[PDB]
Design a protein around this ligand. Structure first.
Ligand SMILES: Nc1ncnc2c1ncn2[C@@H]1O[C@H](COP(=O)(O)OP(=O)(O)O)[C@@H](O)[C@H]1O
Ligand SMILES: Nc1ncnc2c1ncn2[C@@H]1O[C@H](COP(=O)(O)OP(=O)(O)O)[C@@H](O)[C@H]1O
Ligand SMILES: Nc1ncnc2c1ncn2[C@@H]1O[C@H](COP(=O)(O)OP(=O)(O)O)[C@@H](O)[C@H]1O
Ligand SMILES: [Mg+2]
Ligand SMILES: [Mg+2]
Ligand SMILES: [Mg+2]
Lengths: 49, 104, 212, 529, 532, 528
């Protein structure tokens, strides 16, 4: 996997290949994608990978 | 010179004196040349073209220029060359290696 | 206070850069503004007759062309207006429309211009916003519909308040007749539709010969 | 650039509004700006130099010749001009004199470095050559220096040095008087064992009116305040001063304190207590035999009238530094409260007087005729405040020069003689070095020769001819004291003309100019927003 | 100090800017190289759509500001004009040459030395190509032309249908063959009229053994088919004879006005009768024909075509043997029209092509002509077919004129790179670096071809270089000079036996043009942009 | 692209993906390196940066220049971060890390353009960096003699090499000697806070001095201070954290009395409290009193009457340095001022330095501190002198930790390039190209040295390569002689850890930059 440079709204730079971190730092607006992101976050909290 | 307190008229006369002396020196260093010597003309043309973008093409352009000048004047009894007699035609396409010396 | 005779001398020649920096922008500014002085201010301050042929004129004006019908060109900025207006030649006739959204009369004559451009290829119909043109706000109230016509840098059409002279439901026939009876619209020509296209280019003259 | 793929290309925040100068063009711009500053300064060099008349942001006008002051008040925006200002200020703080010579020398050095760079020499090599030539010049200055006596028994060399320092200023009308008062002020307050001269013990202050010739040195303290009660005498002789830092008011605890009055007896006791405290403090002051009382925090009407009634002149609201100076001069201790006041803590002064200043209603107190006053004050009079400020800074320059003489007693003869000799030594040394640094050393010598040229230009003489003649005479007859006869006295021997400059000043000038020129030559990029 | 009203860039800054502009122009079209290249498509401000693969067309359509980028765009235009193929490879090579030359310059190598090295490298590359990498087409036959056309049409909209389009192209080119003085056969391409019309699929494109006009008969009265056509070509209008500007009619006796008015059209009537009396059947004119003359032609059962394009009329007259007539005036001062100036054809029809009609002049005598009607799905597709067809025609013309071809798929580039890398060590001291960089930059073509196919570019180019190095070092295995790139499978392949050819003139001209453009850009080391 | 009535990401989000993104990242890194290229080597040049407020910073250190550059490119900030890392861990080499990282990226750019997989490049970089670090550790020259004079000379040479690129390079021997002397009298932690650095405007560079003790500026003397003696020959220093002046006993303290006798008693009690504190100080035998808290005018006059020196509001750092020099203990209470907690120095004296008064504590025989008093003609001059001395101090500390040095001037990197190329010649060939690119990129530093000096870098590099190929490990660049020379014999020494950290950080930065494939930039909230 390839690392992704993500700049959030506060100009804090994240470079990582962790899906949960990328989704967290992405300003997702489509609510269906929001639901999928929430499922991914729940997976991160429950297991960690 | 001016910062040292020299009036800008002594400077002019001194420069005139230096110019006259330098002209004399340059004339002393000179060497006579005759138009029948093609080698010196070719060398002068090549030296002129050395500093331009066509320097790589000098082996073609220098004889071209020498021939162009010698074909529009009389080698004997000629004190000037009228460059209006050498018409230059610019045609796009090809390379500089395709330059020609059409005599018509 | 004495020394009125100043003779600023070296000053202006040592400050040419910045003064010319202002001067070029000012030149653009009043060139653009004077390109619309000649319209602004003074305009706003100032049974064959039953048209039997009008219906059939609309009938064969419906058949615009084959490949769609395009649209009317829109000017983005005043600089764009200037750099599209100073180009081309005198033979090109340009009609320009100032408009705003929602106000009456714009849609009808916009469609009229669309179909006219469809059946008058030579002309260069185009439309520009009132905000884009930067005209006086007096125009922005009471001078929006203005069938403005240009021809190679000089005015040839002087038409504003076209709603009064045409109405609100006026169709292509009405505006076309109104423009042609002022001697503005060029004479139409019989134009046919080829297959699609023939002329790719004509640059090389190596065509044919039969030398022995 | 915006990338070869057409995508946005942003690197530095707000890079569109920023500017950058790269390489040798930036160095040329710096050299030209520094040359402009130095050529502005060079007109105010020497006895014939002309003053610059500076106006601040509020319209206040300052007519001055001090280079450091001129550059400090100059509103510059270029960074190299700020570097010149800082260089002049540094020369001022370290020495106090020669703040104009450093700027001219740096400008000449950068001007020569410009034509050295034009011929293809790396600026680091120019800086190295300048450093070598500066070392040679400093060693030559040490070689050709001369020593003077710095004893109080004979002050002629000190007076001559102070006169040389003050020659370029406007106070040259009172030249010898100003030199003498500066020398006496420095020598009266100084630690003779080559230690420091505490400038905080020299109170320099001036008052408008009178004449510039009326400036005098007081071997005591002059105070702006006057006697509190208008009916006390204006003259006190053989005063036994009692310096106090406690206001003549009933005592008050610093801690938050409430005093509760619960009955008529308590009120009567409080009133009697206040009255007795006033009387007790006055009697305590009187018991020491003091003639004059000096307070720092003022006092109220009861204390004032008791002081008047007991023939005790007094002054209130004397400043803290003023209290310190009075205590030092009069040889008396500072007493924090009356209960600790004894006769042994009293100061002495032969005369305490109140001074009038014409039709101005302003009064000033002078304390003088002390026994062995270690603190002095300089009272400057003038026709306007501008010449008063100029006299203040000129006297400060003289005091700094005499302080430098206290620190080191080696002098060299000014008027361009030292610079010409240093240039000759540098040129002689450059003839033996490998030719690569020879150009830099010769350029340094040429830059050193700008001071005599500027002196001759300001004095109206032809620069190049006079400088060449003086240099030829210096080479012919080995007299390194021959300089530029700026005053047209008819001779060139500055040793005979008594034009004397401290060696430390010249060494600091050369060193500071060399380091600043090196730093400027080492800068190649600028990134102003 | 300068006090020039403008902006100035000097030194490495302007060189980097020029390299950036050239690299941007290269990267614009770098994705459209080789059979795995994909077409681009451009939308103008008005809304016009142009789907294209030709680099020259793409660079012409784009609006460009930077002068060096304009230089590369004009270089592509020149390559298109003087060759007709390789307009993308020349741009890519020029940009890579500029990039590598600037990389050398950044290492404190003087630009003059780099320019001299590039000049020598170009000369030696041309010499090596002409001496080793050319294949004569005499022994290959028509298959050489077919393979060259197929290679040219690869990466185009007509790539897969090459098996048929190459046959059509070769037939069209051979149809317009003519020999001139000095006995040199000549192939005047652009004399093949390319007609587009949406409709049926690509395979329904027709090659006309004659000529095709995008014109129709002026009136519905005339027949739309004539068997034994007698074509008469005229360069003047057939209208009522209005007198010239210098002639004015003034009537003082009213009895002559009617005679004047009658003669005003009787003149044209007599001219048309003279034209028709010789037996002419088809009449083509560049000028207009009004209703009276159209009726005159209708009554005689002939064809009249008006507003015929001048080039089309010239081609028709030359093919059919007819002569263009500005006036019907002979050397005796009267009006005549002899039969010796009538053209002939075996049939003239007005075919219907997708709800539209065009005139077909089939099987002209005394000379064989050709025309191509392209049928596509829509206008954009037909335009792309026309561009690709023109490229193929130019390639076939170059192959037939100069009988030397070179293997494709980057074989020439790899061979040149290896040879120049070996040869650089024998020339100069600092020119060798320039020659080596020239050789390296020549490798951009196979790298781009491999990249566009999503193949391992590094391994493929390494294998190609190893093959060519072994060919050049082993005198008994010279047959490996033809090893190119097989993009379908991503493996090296003998392109000479695989029928992947292209004219040598393409490579030579592209190399010379790219070298001269890189030299021109490299000379700049300072920019003064005067403010408008 | 389609409108997609409900968009997925926030409006204005900017994204870049693929090879062009990585190429743009490499170009940005090259641009960043170009800003500090010229500040490398003895012939380096200073850079001037002006902030928004207008303050100008003149510097040669790469980390300072990069920090002053407000870089916002996400890939370019990696170079700034690794420069900061090199400054923090080592202190020298902030330019070298950026140059090496940018050169690595530039060398692998052509391979990235032809679609090479980034993971292969990353693996090649890791292997090459590990091999280079091992080679540096193997060939680093160390002496197992533990000689005092030899290690002093080694530290001096390392400091001279670390200083011969700044504006103090003319007096590099003098400054290096002072730096070594200062470091050698630190006990075990080598804390930077234990080496004071004071900058005084005005004076030549050679006038800068190192104080074998502590020295600090005069701090707002009150009235009566000028009557105190300013020189002592065996003073006892009382280090205090105490406010010696009349004030409220406590913030919340309140006094309630109903008798004038109690009022007078309270006033006398306050005065007696202060006087008892002063008597306790006096009876301790101390002659110099130093307090962190303000000292009032009453206490100043009291000490003047007893012929003592007092200085209130002394900063924490200066008080700690004085404690470590004289050898006392800061007392928050004066109730037990035994002789154990009293500092002692040979000579105390107040002198004038460049128009300012500085208190001097000298003659401390067991001092563990220093105080650099730097003189210069400008504030930025002194700031850059402090920066250069800081670099030298860090270098000397690292050399004190271990005496492992390699010859500078590019010799070490030329040897590393030769070794890496030789290693790459014996591997399959996909990694061979990348390792050869790494070795070629290792040549940037000598080339940059020659370019800054004005040489012809090509000839010098050719001669260095020929010399290293035939043997000779420590041949670098002779700047003065326009040629090459054995830099180890020329005493161009640097600690091996400097180059080890430089290589490690540059490799990590290059791998991090190459690993990134997509850049996403969310719109910034609160545009204001
Ligand atoms: N009487 C004099 N004769 C000749 N030169 C003098 C005389 N007095 C002063 N100078 C010269 O004038 C120069 C300028 O001195 P001054 O203006 O007082 O301070 P600064 O050196 O800061 O300009 C000194 O270098 C000194 O050598
Ligand atoms: N079938 C094929 N197999 C391998 N290579 C080919 C094939 N067809 C064309 N090529 C190569 O692809 C390259 C790109 O040609 P192309 O881009 O279509 O021409 P242009 O540069 O005029 O657009 C040519 O140099 C040619 O050698
Ligand atoms: N006398 C010298 N001769 C040759 N090279 C030197 C000399 N002194 C230092 N260097 C080189 O300068 C480089 C360090 O430059 P400098 O700017 O001081 O620190 P940085 O490593 O941060 O660039 C080292 O790589 C060293 O090899
Ligand atoms: Mg002076
Ligand atoms: Mg092609
Ligand atoms: Mg360093």
């Amino acid at each position: 996997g390839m690392n992704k440079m993500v700049i959030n709204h506060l100009e804090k730079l994240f470079v990582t290949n962790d899906a949960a971190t990328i989704l967290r730092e992405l300003e997702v607006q489509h609510p269906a994608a929001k639901m999928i992101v929430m499922a991914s976050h729940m997976q991160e909290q429950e297991v960690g990978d | 010179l001016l910062q040292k307190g020299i009036h800008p008229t002594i400077i002019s006369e001194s420069f005139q004196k230096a110019l006259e002396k330098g002209i004399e020196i340059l004339t002393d260093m000179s060497r006579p040349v005759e138009l029948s010597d093609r080698e010196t003309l070719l060398n002068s043309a090549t030296t002129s073209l050395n500093s331009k973008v066509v320097s790589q093409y000098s082996s073609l352009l220098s004889p071209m220029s020498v021939n162009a000048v010698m074909k529009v004047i009389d080698p004997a009894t000629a004190t000037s060359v009228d460059l209006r007699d050498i018409k230059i035609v610019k045609k796009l396409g090809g390379t500089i290696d395709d330059c020609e010396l059409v005599e018509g | 206070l004495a020394g009125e005779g100043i003779s600023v001398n070296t000053g202006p020649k040592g400050v040419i850069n910045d003064w010319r920096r202002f001067k070029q922008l000012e030149t653009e500014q009043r060139e653009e503004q004077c390109r619309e002085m000649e319209r602004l201010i003074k305009k706003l301050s100032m049974f064959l007759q039953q048209y039997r042929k009008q219906r059939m004129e609309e009938m064969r004006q419906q058949l615009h062309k084959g490949p769609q019908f395009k649209q009317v060109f829109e000017i983005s900025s005043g600089e764009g207006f200037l750099d599209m207006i100073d180009k081309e030649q005198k033979s090109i006739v340009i009609m320009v429309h100032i408009y705003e959204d929602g106000i009456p009369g714009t849609e009808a004559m916009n469609g009229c211009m669309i179909c006219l451009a469809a059946e008058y290829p030579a002309v260069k119909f185009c439309k520009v916003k009132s905000s884009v043109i930067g005209a006086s706000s007096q125009f922005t109230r009471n001078a929006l519909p203005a069938l403005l016509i240009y021809k190679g840098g000089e005015l040839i059409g002087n038409f504003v308040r076209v709603t009064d002279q045409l109405g609100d439901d006026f169709f292509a026939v009405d505006l076309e007749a109104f423009l042609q009876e002022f001697g503005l619209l060029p004479e139409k020509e019989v134009l046919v539709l080829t297959s699609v296209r023939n002329s790719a280019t004509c640059h090389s003259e190596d065509s044919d010969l039969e030398i022995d | 650039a915006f990338d070869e793929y057409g995508r946005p290309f942003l690197i530095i925040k707000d890079q569109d509004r920023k500017s950058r100068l790269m390489g040798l063009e930036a160095l040329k711009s710096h050299i030209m700006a520094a040359k402009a500053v130095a050529n502005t300064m060079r007109t105010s060099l020497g006895p014939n130099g002309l003053d610059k008349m500076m106006v601040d942001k509020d319209g206040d006008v300052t007519v001055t010749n001090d280079g450091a002051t001129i550059l400090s008040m100059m509103d510059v925006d270029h960074q190299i001009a700020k570097l010149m200002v800082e260089l002049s200020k540094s020369q001022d703080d370290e020495i106090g004199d020669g703040t104009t010579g450093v700027v001219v020398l740096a400008g000449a050095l950068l001007e020569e470095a410009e034509q050295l760079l034009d011929r293809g020499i790396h600026p680091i090599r120019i800086a190295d050559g300048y450093e070598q030539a500066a070392r040679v010049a400093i060693e030559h200055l040490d070689k050709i220096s001369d020593s003077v006596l710095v004893d109080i028994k004979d002050t002629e060399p000190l007076i001559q040095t102070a006169k040389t320092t003050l020659g370029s200023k406007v106070v040259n009308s009172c030249h010898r008087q100003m030199a003498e008062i500066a020398v006496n002020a420095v020598l009266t307050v100084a630690d003779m064992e080559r230690r420091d001269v505490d400038f905080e013990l020299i109170k320099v202050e001036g008052k408008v009116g009178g004449r510039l010739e009326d400036t005098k040195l007081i071997k005591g303290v002059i105070v702006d305040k006057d006697f509190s009660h208008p009916q006390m005498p204006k003259k006190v002789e053989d005063a036994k001063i009692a310096i106090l830092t406690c206001p003549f008011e009933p005592p008050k605890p610093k801690t938050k304190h409430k005093l509760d009055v619960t009955s008529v007896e308590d009120y009567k006791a409080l009133q009697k207590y206040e009255k007795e405290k006033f009387e007790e403090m006055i009697q305590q002051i009187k018991e020491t035999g003091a003639n004059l009382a000096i307070c720092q925090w003022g006092f109220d009407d009861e204390a004032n009238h008791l002081l008047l009634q007991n023939n005790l002149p007094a002054v209130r609201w004397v400043g803290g530094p003023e209290i310190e100076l009075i205590a030092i001069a009069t040889g008396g201790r500072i007493v924090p409260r009356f209960s600790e006041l004894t006769a042994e803590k009293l100061g002495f002064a032969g005369l305490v007087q109140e001074i009038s200043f014409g039709t101005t209603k302003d009064k000033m107190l002078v304390i003088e005729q002390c026994k062995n006053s270690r603190a002095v004050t300089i009272f400057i009079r003038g026709g306007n405040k501008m010449i008063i400020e100029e006299a203040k800074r000129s006297l400060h320059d003289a005091l700094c020069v005499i302080r430098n003489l206290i620190r080191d007693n080696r002098v060299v003869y000014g008027g361009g003689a030292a610079e010409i000799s240093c240039a000759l030594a540098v040129s002689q040394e450059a003839d033996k070095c490998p030719t690569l640094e020879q150009y830099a050393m010769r350029a340094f010598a040429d830059a050193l020769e700008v001071i005599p040229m500027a002196l001759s230009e300001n004095s109206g003489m032809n620069p190049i001819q006079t400088m060449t003649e003086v240099r030829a005479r210096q080479v012919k007859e080995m007299n390194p004291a021959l300089g530029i006869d700026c005053l047209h006295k008819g001779t060139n021997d500055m040793k005979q003309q008594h034009v004397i400059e401290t060696l430390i000043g010249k060494k600091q000038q050369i060193s500071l100019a060399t380091q600043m020129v090196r730093m400027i030559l080492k800068i190649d990029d600028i990134r102003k927003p | 100090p300068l006090s020039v009203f403008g902006d100035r860039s000097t030194g490495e800054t302007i060189r980097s800017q020029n390299v950036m502009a050239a690299a941007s122009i290269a990267n614009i079209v770098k994705s459209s190289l080789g059979p795995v290249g994909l077409d681009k498509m451009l939308v103008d401000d008005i809304g016009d759509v142009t789907i294209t693969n030709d680099g020259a067309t793409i660079l012409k359509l784009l609006e460009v500001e930077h002068p060096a980028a304009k230089v590369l765009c004009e270089l592509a235009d020149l390559q298109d004009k003087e060759v007709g193929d390789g307009t993308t490879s020349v741009v890519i090579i020029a940009a890579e040459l500029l990039k590598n030359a600037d990389e050398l310059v950044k290492q404190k190598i003087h630009p003059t030395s780099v320019i001299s090295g590039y000049r020598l490298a170009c000369k030696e590359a041309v010499r090596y190509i002409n001496e080793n990498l050319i294949v004569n087409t005499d022994e290959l036959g028509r298959d050489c032309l077919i393979n060259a056309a197929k290679t040219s049409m690869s990466s185009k909209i007509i790539g897969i249908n090459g098996d048929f389009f190459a046959n059509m192209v070769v037939d069209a080119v051979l149809a317009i063959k003519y020999t001139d003085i000095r006995g040199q056969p000549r192939y005047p391409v652009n004399s093949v009229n390319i007609l587009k019309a949406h409709g049926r699929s690509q395979m329904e494109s027709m090659l006309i053994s004659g000529y095709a006009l995008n014109c129709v008969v002026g009136s519905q009265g005339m027949p739309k088919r004539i068997v034994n056509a007698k074509i008469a070509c005229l360069d003047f209008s057939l209208q009522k004879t209005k007198m010239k500007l210098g002639v004015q009619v003034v009537i003082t006796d009213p009895e002559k006005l009617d005679q004047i008015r009658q003669r005003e059209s009787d003149i044209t009537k007599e001219r048309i009768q003279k034209i028709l009396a010789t037996g002419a059947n088809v009449i083509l004119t560049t000028g207009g024909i009004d209703d009276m003359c159209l009726k005159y032609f209708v009554e005689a059962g002939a064809m009249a075509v008006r507003r015929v394009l001048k080039r089309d009329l010239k081609r028709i007259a030359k093919a059919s043997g007819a002569t263009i007539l500005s006036t019907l005036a002979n050397l005796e001062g009267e009006e005549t029209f002899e039969a010796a100036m009538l053209g002939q054809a075996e049939e003239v029809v007005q075919e219907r092509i997708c709800d539209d009609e065009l005139i077909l002049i089939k099987n002209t005598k005394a000379r064989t002509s050709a025309s191509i009607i392209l049928r596509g799905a829509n206008d954009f597709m037909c335009d792309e077919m026309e561009r690709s067809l023109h490229d193929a025609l130019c390639v076939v013309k170059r192959v037939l004129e100069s009988k030397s071809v070179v293997p494709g798929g980057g074989a020439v580039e790899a061979a040149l790179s290896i040879y120049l890398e070996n040869y650089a060590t024998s020339m100069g001291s600092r020119e060798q670096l320039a020659i080596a960089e020239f050789a390296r930059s020549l490798l951009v073509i196979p790298n781009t071809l491999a990249v566009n196919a999503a193949q391992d570019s590094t391994d493929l180019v390494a294998k190609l270089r190893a093959f060519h190095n072994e060919a050049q070092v082993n005198p008994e295995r010279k047959n490996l000079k033809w090893i190119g790139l097989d993009l379908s499978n991503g493996k090296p392949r003998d392109n000479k036996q695989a029928g992947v050819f292209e004219p040598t003139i393409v490579k030579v001209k592209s190399l010379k043009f790219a070298t001269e453009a890189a030299i021109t850009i490299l000379r700049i080391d300072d920019l003064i942009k005067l403010h408008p | 692209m389609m409108p997609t009535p409900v968009i997925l990401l926030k409006e204005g989000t900017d994204s870049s993906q693929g090879i062009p993104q990585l190429v743009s990242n490499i170009s940005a890194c090259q641009v960043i390196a170009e800003a500090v290229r010229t500040t490398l080597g003895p012939r380096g040049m200073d850079k001037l940066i002006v902030d928004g407020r207008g303050k100008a910073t003149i510097s040669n250190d790469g980390a300072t220049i990069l920090k002053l550059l407000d870089v916002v490119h996400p890939a370019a900030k990696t170079l700034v971060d690794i420069a900061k890392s090199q400054d923090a861990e080592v202190g020298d080499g902030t330019t070298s890390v950026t140059l090496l990282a940018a050169e690595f990226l530039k060398q692998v750019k052509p391979y990235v353009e032809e679609g090479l997989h980034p993971q292969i490049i990353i693996r090649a970089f890791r292997t090459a960096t590990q091999l280079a670090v091992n080679k540096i550790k193997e060939i680093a020259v160390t002496v197992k003699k533990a000689d005092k004079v030899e290690q002093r000379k080694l530290l001096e040479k390392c400091a001279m090499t670390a200083l011969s690129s700044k504006l103090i390079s003319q007096q590099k021997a003098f400054f290096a000697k002072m730096v070594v002397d200062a470091v050698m009298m630190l006990d075990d932690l080598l804390q930077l806070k234990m080496i004071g650095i004071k900058k005084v405007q005005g004076g030549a560079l050679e006038d800068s001095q190192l104080v074998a003790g502590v020295a600090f500026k005069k701090t707002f003397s009150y009235a009566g201070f000028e009557m105190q003696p300013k020189k002592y020959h065996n003073p006892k220093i009382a280090l205090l954290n105490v406010e010696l002046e009349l004030k409220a006993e406590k913030d919340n303290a309140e006094i309630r009395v109903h008798t004038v006798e109690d009022y007078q008693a309270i006033v006398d009690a306050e005065w007696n409290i202060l006087y008892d504190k002063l008597e306790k100080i006096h009876h301790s035998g101390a002659k110099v009193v130093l307090s962190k808290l303000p000292i009032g005018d009453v206490a100043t006059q009291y000490f003047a009457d007893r012929d003592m020196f007092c200085a209130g509001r002394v900063p924490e750092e200066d008080l700690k340095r004085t404690m470590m020099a004289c050898g006392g203990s800061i007392q928050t209470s004066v109730n037990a001022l035994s002789a154990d907690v009293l500092g002692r120095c040979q000579v105390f004296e107040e002198t004038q330095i460049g128009g300012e008064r500085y208190n001097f504590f000298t003659g401390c025989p067991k001092a563990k501190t220093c105080t650099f008093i730097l003189r210069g003609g400008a504030e930025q001059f002194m700031e850059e002198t402090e920066r250069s001395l800081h670099d030298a101090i860090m270098i000397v500390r690292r050399a004190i930790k271990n005496d492992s040095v390699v010859a500078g001037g590019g010799a070490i990197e030329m040897e590393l390039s030769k070794y890496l190329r030789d290693y790459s010649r014996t591997i399959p060939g996909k990694q061979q190209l990348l390792i050869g690119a790494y070795a070629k990129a290792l040549e940037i530093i000598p080339r940059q040295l020659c370019d800054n000096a004005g040489f012809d870098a090509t000839n010098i590099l050719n001669k260095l390569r020929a010399r290293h190929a035939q043997g000779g490990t420590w041949y670098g660049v002779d700047i003065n002689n326009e040629d090459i020379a054995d830099n180890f014999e020329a005493f161009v020494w640097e600690p091996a850890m400097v180059r080890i950290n430089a290589l490690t950080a540059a490799s990590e930065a290059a791998c991090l930059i190459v690993s990134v494939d997509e850049t996403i930039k969310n719109p910034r909230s609160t545009v204001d």
